[PDB]
């Protein structure tokens with residue numbers, strides 16, 4: 001809070017998951033952010049369900065993509081603020097199809113009351129993150145299929161196409177960076193994670209930053 005913050009070292013982040021063939025990155029970003037926010041509201045870290053959004057959120061488009069802000073407003077406005085546990089509504093997409101929504105046989109693992117959209121400014125996004133926790137962001141991920149590790153320092157920044165989770169930053173590094181949780185298993189990047197240079201809107205990281213609010 002300045003200097004460096006890694007929310008992984010504060011027990012606030014669940015393991016890296018796998019979206020597979022589904023275009024559900026939006027749901028991973030939105031849920032990942034909720035999981036962290038719920039913990040930080042003084043609740044035990046619980047794995048929550050992306051499948052609930054992919055199959056039940058009809059404000060977005062399942063395996064064809066969607067937006068984290070729409071998912072946040074669907075939870076509040078349509079699902080009474082409920083977020084089911086991953087355990088009671090396990091990921092069933094992956095082959096690239098979303099089975100139909102089942103409205104019962106699930107347990108509420110978390111509830112949100114709304115969401116805030118953060119300024120398009122990295123210094124301000126970092127200020128909020130430092131105190132309030134992980135933020136969901138949209139990024140141009142064009143370069144990311146060849147990311148093997150290290151802090152990227154140069155990234156194609158032409159079109160926002162992927163949703164991810166910002167879990168920290170370190171401005172004490174030789175090149176300050178952001179640390180991002182991705183959803184392409186642990187086999188990609190630094191054990192599922194990516195580090196990009198902070199301060200130059202790499203991969204357009206400041207353009208659509210938002211977060212769920214609990215309580």
Ligand SMILES: *CC(=O)[C@H](C)NC(=O)[C@H](CCCNC(N)N)NC(=O)OCc1ccccc1
Nearest residue numbers: 023024025026060061065066138160161162163
């Ligand atoms: C990461 C993915 O899995 C896929 C296939 N794409 C999406 O989820 C993108 C991510 C966000 C990209 N661009 C932004 N400006 N945020 N979503 C997408 O393009 O969603 C579109 C959409 C819009 C309105 C209603 C339904 C769907």
